[PDB]
Design a protein around this ligand. Structure first.
Ligand SMILES: Nc1ncnc2c1ncn2[C@@H]1O[C@H](CSCC[C@H](N)C(=O)O)[C@@H](O)[C@H]1O
Ligand SMILES: Nc1ncnc2c1ncn2[C@@H]1O[C@H](CSCC[C@H](N)C(=O)O)[C@@H](O)[C@H]1O
Lengths: 284, 284
């Protein structure tokens, strides 16, 4: 049940030429991570509004559409939502789509103790659950197979959000984490033992074709911005290194003989994850 | 000196949400082909203004900026040129950049016979060449090493446009070809013996990791549109097949276990070329 996390700088968005393209770029980052079943995106400050906007946009696209009205008030950072590309991930389904799992928001309707909670799972009727939970929390509902066809609510139980993947093979979205500097990308990892495999990307790294990935459980691929990973490194007072290869288990160039002087970050992610997917599958 | 050609449908542009994004998409196609040193892009009609616009935009970005004013009158298809991303390819260089090769446009200035031609290569002074050529033709000038430092023109000789690559290792741009249907992608190949390796892309193809590419000299990777390669196949009266795998030497899925229902064409190109680059280098 290995994980993959991706770190890019929020400053990527400042290089955009129009506010629309600023949004659209943010959407391209989300789709690339969704395509490769990324579990976590880490938006880090290379030098703070660029990272907030990027993270927010990432969270909006990750969130099942029927839940965005509840989790996202009207925000200026979402003023160009429409011109986006849907993630079309397995938890972004329509209402007339049978599914074993379904994301949900715990509603505010009265319930005597003992009587579980009501959850909006975007179905025709709400879902009554087992546990009594706070009303406004996002949960992962597993629906009862044999339901009670005339009941005014469906029934299911709140399960771990990692159940759809580690149990049914279904990609179920990423989480988004805001990092305040480059060293916080590593130090603030969501996992106890940290990232046991860390992969940095540069045109000065070694050839990906020669790289050998060790067995792992939590992998982090890290991408720089306009100025490369060198900028977040020099900016960070914690770091104090001369060359970024030393902060990573591996420092790879994933496009030998590129035909353009520069690969932009959103292009580098698709190329890098493609070029690493073989080794990532087999090592995990 | 093997070649790689990429075929996509011009209809890709109709799916865009705003005229700006229509342009920007076209720019993403060019950058992806430039990054992987593609030699030829084939824009084919899946069903005709979408393919013309796409081809034109591709030719504009390929063309050294100092030559675009000459080769491109003011066109409505270029009304959003600015919001593009430069290719930044080795033949897109500044004026104070020494280079052995340099693209050029044969100028209109008088010349007695015997006296070669004048070529604008975007330098401080024009270039006098060996041959007497038509005035308005795009050529590839190789500059004389020892030039004559006080002469009012530089000197060089017109060489094959395939010299910068097959001689100095430099990527030197793609050409753009308009195809009228899917079978014209193959039949109208710029090479005598055709494409001896043809690779189709679909989520229904075999796993790229198992594919074995035969030795080759001219390779063509083909990408479908919104409706996949099935649409250009059914539309084309020449074809008359039930499943597209039979039109290609290889039919590959290049993203096992995608996390999104659909990979858009501009995303599929970066992922596919990355996933095939290893085998493409070694086989050619
Ligand atoms: N060939 C390549 N291999 C792997 N990653 C690359 C790459 N080219 C660009 N990238 C990624 O895309 C990001 C932006 S490209 C910025 C390049 C910068 N001028 C520099 O010299 O560092 C980089 O930080 C890197 O993470
Ligand atoms: N997993 C994958 N592997 C290789 N190419 C893919 C791919 N997913 C999408 N593509 C490419 O991107 C194009 C647009 S995606 C269109 C998919 C369409 N619904 C269908 O079923 O065919 C496709 O024509 C294909 O060339």
């Amino acid at each position: 049940p290995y994980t993959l996390s991706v770190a890019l700088p929020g400053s990527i968005l400042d290089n955009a030429q129009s506010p629309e393209l600023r949004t659209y770029l943010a959407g391209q980052i989300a789709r690339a991570c969704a395509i490769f079943c990324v579990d976590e995106i880490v938006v880090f400050d290379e030098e703070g509004q660029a990272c907030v906007q990027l993270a927010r946009i990432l969270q909006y696209l990750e969130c099942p559409q029927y839940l965005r009205k509840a989790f996202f008030p009207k925000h200026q950072d979402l003023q160009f939502a429409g011109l986006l590309n849907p993630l079309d991930s397995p938890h972004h389904m329509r209402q007339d789509e049978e599914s074993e799992f379904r994301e949900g928001i715990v509603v505010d309707r009265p319930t005597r103790p003992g009587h579980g909670s009501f959850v909006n799972c975007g179905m025709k009727k709400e879902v009554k659950i087992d546990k009594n939970l706070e009303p406004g929390l996002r949960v992962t509902v597993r629906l009862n197979q044999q339901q009670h066809p005339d009941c005014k609510t469906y029934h299911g139980k709140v399960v771990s959000s990692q159940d759809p993947r580690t149990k049914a093979g279904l990609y179920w979205g990423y989480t988004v984490r805001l990092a305040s500097c480059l060293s916080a990308v590593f130090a603030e990892a969501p996992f106890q033992d940290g990232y046991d495999l860390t992969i940095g990307t540069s045109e000065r790294g070694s050839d990906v074709a020669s790289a050998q990935l060790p067995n792992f459980r939590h992998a982090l691929v890290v991408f720089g911005g306009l100025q490369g990973l060198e900028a977040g490194a020099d900016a960070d007072p914690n770091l104090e290194v001369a060359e970024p290869s030393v902060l990573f288990d591996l420092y790879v160039n994933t496009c030998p003989g590129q035909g353009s002087r520069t690969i932009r970050t959103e292009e580098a992610i698709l190329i890098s994850l493609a070029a690493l997917q073989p080794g990532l599958i087999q090592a995990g």
